[PDB]
């Protein structure tokens, strides 16, 4: 449901893949002639019906008049986005002039202008009674061009009135309302999700693209706030509009699955998607076949070959369906290459009864399942899956507008012959290489590592930090141990200094030791971290805040990781002497390259 929003949600927040800013040198691509692509139109043909049933869909006054907010909110955004447009001219002017006081004054003057009227209509979009979920992806898109518009007034505070203090109380207000749109956002996200969750008859699948498309239109928003900061994360001297890069390790699913439904949204949520767990690549499926009867062949079960980031170890799953006589195994597909859509095809009535899958690749080959069937049923149909930024081909994207790739395959039997087939899919964001960039801080999530011990499990994430965490706890004997490899990137220099940040939450000052392997040697540190948060009873919380995570600087500009260029590095995290209920969960670790800037900044 809605195509020209599970495309155009991480479109234009995700119109920065490398080179994309004005701060000095022409410019002729995403700055200027923005006009032509920011807001051309609004909104000619239908969309965005999801997310609206919480507003009375029950009968075609409420729905009309729900029709309509809809169409004020765009126009609002669109209003928002000319505001800004403003303000990227006059700060441009300015930026080709530094020393003119009139291009200064003018860009300050709409700096303050355009800052208000997006603060202004987030407070609009958050706190229309009876249509917060409605406008939730709007409120998400607007909230995140007030964060971005702030830490350019934090960016050049300096330059354009007397630094910070009056650039303080500007960065406390940022921290403020990154705190405000998140709540708002979690908040109302779950309200929806229980709404749904306790529907009668409650169908999975709608509980399911609820999910998606939260994900893809407001979670993963919220995941790039954090990045926002300035102090923390210092802009690109170069161009200001590159930020670290936030990735999105959490899965997302589609299925194929009989409608309607009498099993449950819990059953078939255990059925069809997975436990939290390391970010896993997809490397071989493995497929089974009924064939005992060979005008009856259809799917039976399918194994999934996978790896940890940057392993060299193949895991396999449990087999998922039935494996009992007469399911066959059938197939075994090398997926060499990333897959960036399917298609499954079974019979029509009885439905789910599966035929065919194919797999389009990057490289652009096709793996295909097939269960060979002879002869070929009647009333066969086929459906694609897949996620396009083109808005006209909603699951169909082609090799260059897909933005996720397939992640996992599970299959969950109805009745003899007949499945439900889910599909998982990462955002292709994440890096397989967990590349340490020379030129960025760089952002590894904890989930990324590839080595857990007993005591050290993946969390569900809160649900805006993009994805889950990994929790370091204790046995009272046995402390949990992270470890996660790195590949630095090709250099000239013999060595290079980088520090290494850790985004976490913990339940007490608990003392860490962080190391890094170059090359079978070892180097280690040892820093502690603050208490950050508290739960009843000790449980490992659900429900961190942002406000809960902080960071600590295991190596800095004093005591650097000294690494070579194009390695394999292998960073790990342990608690030392830590007691029962102590917790320490891992968000991400950072890479912070050190230059004459952090040399100050240490």
């Not at 086929?382 to 090799?399: M, W």
């Not at 013999?494 to 070892?522: D, E, F």
Request: glycine content about 4%; proline content about 4%; aromatic content about 10%.
């Amino acid at each position: 449901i809605n195509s020209s929003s599970v495309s155009t949600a991480l479109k234009v927040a995700g119109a920065i893949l490398k080179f994309v800013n004005p701060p000095a040198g022409t410019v002729l691509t995403v700055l200027s002639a923005v006009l032509p692509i920011l807001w051309p139109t609004n909104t000619p043909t239908p969309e965005r019906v999801w997310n609206d049933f919480m507003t009375n869909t029950g009968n075609l006054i409420d729905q009309t008049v729900t029709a309509y907010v809809r169409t004020d909110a765009n126009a609002k955004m669109t209003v928002v986005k000319d505001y800004l447009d403003q303000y990227t001219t006059k700060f441009n002017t300015w930026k080709r002039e530094p020393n003119n006081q009139s291009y200064r004054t003018a860009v300050i003057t709409q700096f303050n202008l355009t800052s208000a009227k997006l603060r202004e209509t987030a407070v609009y979009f958050s706190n229309l009674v009876g249509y917060e979920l409605l406008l939730l992806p709007i409120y998400a898109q607007v909230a995140n061009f007030n964060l971005l518009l702030i830490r350019d007034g934090l960016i050049n505070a300096q330059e354009w009135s007397l630094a910070q203090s009056a650039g303080d109380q500007l960065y406390n207000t940022m921290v403020q309302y990154t705190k405000e749109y998140i709540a708002h956002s979690i908040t109302w996200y779950n309200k929806g999700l229980d709404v749904l969750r306790n529907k009668s008859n409650g169908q999975w699948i709608t509980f399911n693209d609820y999910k998606r498309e939260m994900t893809i239109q407001v979670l993963d928003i919220l995941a790039l706030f954090a990045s926002y900061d300035p102090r923390r994360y210092p802009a690109d001297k170069i161009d200001n509009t590159k930020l670290s890069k936030t990735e999105f390790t959490r899965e997302i699913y589609t299925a194929l699955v009989e409608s309607p439904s009498s099993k449950s949204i819990a059953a078939l949520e255990a059925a069809l998607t997975r436990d939290v767990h390391l970010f896993t690549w997809l490397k071989r499926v493995d497929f089974w076949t009924n064939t005992i009867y060979q005008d009856l062949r259809f799917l039976s079960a399918n194994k999934i070959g996978f790896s940890y980031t940057n392993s060299s170890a193949m895991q396999e799953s449990g087999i998922y369906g039935s494996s009992g006589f007469g399911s066959n195994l059938t197939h075994q597909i090398q997926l060499n290459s990333n897959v960036y859509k399917t298609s499954i095809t079974d019979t029509s009535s009885p439905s789910n009864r599966v035929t065919k899958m194919d797999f389009y690749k990057i490289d652009g080959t096709l793996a295909s399942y097939n269960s060979n069937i002879t002869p070929t049923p009647e009333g066969l149909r086929t459906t694609f899956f897949g996620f396009s930024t083109n808005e006209n081909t909603p699951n169909q994207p082609t090799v260059n507008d897909y933005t996720h790739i397939l992640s996992y395959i599970k299959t969950d039997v109805i009745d003899y012959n007949s499945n439900r087939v889910s599909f998982a899919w990462t955002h292709k964001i994440v890096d397989p290489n967990n590349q340490i960039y020379t030129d960025a801080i760089t952002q590894v999530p904890a989930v990324k590592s590839n080595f857990l011990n007993a005591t050290a499990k993946v969390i569900k994430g809160p649900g805006h930090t993009g994805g889950d965490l990994v929790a370091l706890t204790s046995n009272g004997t046995l402390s949990g141990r992270m470890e996660i490899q790195c590949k630095t990137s090709i250099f000239n220099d013999p060595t290079r200094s980088y520090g290494l940040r850790i985004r976490y939450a913990a339940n007490s000052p608990i003392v860490l030791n962080v190391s890094y392997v170059l090359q079978g040697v070892s180097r280690g540190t040892t820093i502690s971290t603050e208490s950050t948060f508290s739960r009843p009873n000790n449980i490992i919380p659900t429900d961190l805040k942002y406000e809960e995570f902080r960071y600590k600087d295991p190596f800095d500009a004093i005591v650097p990781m000294r690494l070579s260029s194009n390695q394999l590095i292998t960073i790990a995290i342990q608690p030392l002497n830590m007691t029962s209920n102590n917790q320490v969960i891992i968000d991400r670790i950072e890479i912070i390259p050190i230059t004459q800037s952090v040399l100050d900044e240490t």
